[PDB]
Structure 1
């Protein structure tokens, strides 16, 4: 699918509150090790004797993924997110 990298939509910033122009990028993610409560809990549960202690998922069925767009306002610098359907090829031409 093709989506242009510019789009005029509504933004809910306190200064704008109207239809403004945004530019479009795609969303990605990160992670954290000596920070997050789940990781700090899992490591202590994992230490010692006993084995694995949590499930491990290996029965993947989907082959594609939904795509999320991040929109940044050119006059406000207030981002917004918008999800699309499942597609196999995506670009921002």
Structure 2
């Protein structure tokens, strides 16, 4: 499905409708100082089996389309999902 690169959308910070640029959400890189990550390094030290489950069977074919909308006035970012479907083409 095709999506426009800019929309007119309500802004909670501005309390009105402003132009929003449309981009694809990209997940951040996992940082080594995250608390769960630090715990996972502590578990990984020493002898033993693999200490955590790793998924081997997957069933989802597509991920939910997560898009990022940025207000052109203040910079407020809204992240909305369009539902599980193939990757949109920003147009």
TM-score by length of 1: 0.88
The answer for the alignment partner of 1:65 in structure 2 is: 63
Q: Which moved more, 1:44-53 or 1:4-13?
A: 44-53
The answer for the alignment partner of 1:36 in structure 2 is: 34
RMSD value, Cα: 1.3
Counting matched residue pairs gives 91
- Given the superposition, is the C-alpha separation of residues 68 and 40 from structure 1 closer, same or farther in structure 2, using an over 3 Å criterion? same
SS in 2 for 1:50: coil
Shift of 1:88: 2.1
The whole-number CA distance in structure 2 between the counterparts of 1:17 and 1:64 is 34
Structure 1 gap segments, 5+ residues each:
none
Structure 2 gap segments, 5+ residues each:
none
TM-score by length of 2: 0.90
The answer for the alignment partner of 2:12 in structure 1 is: 12
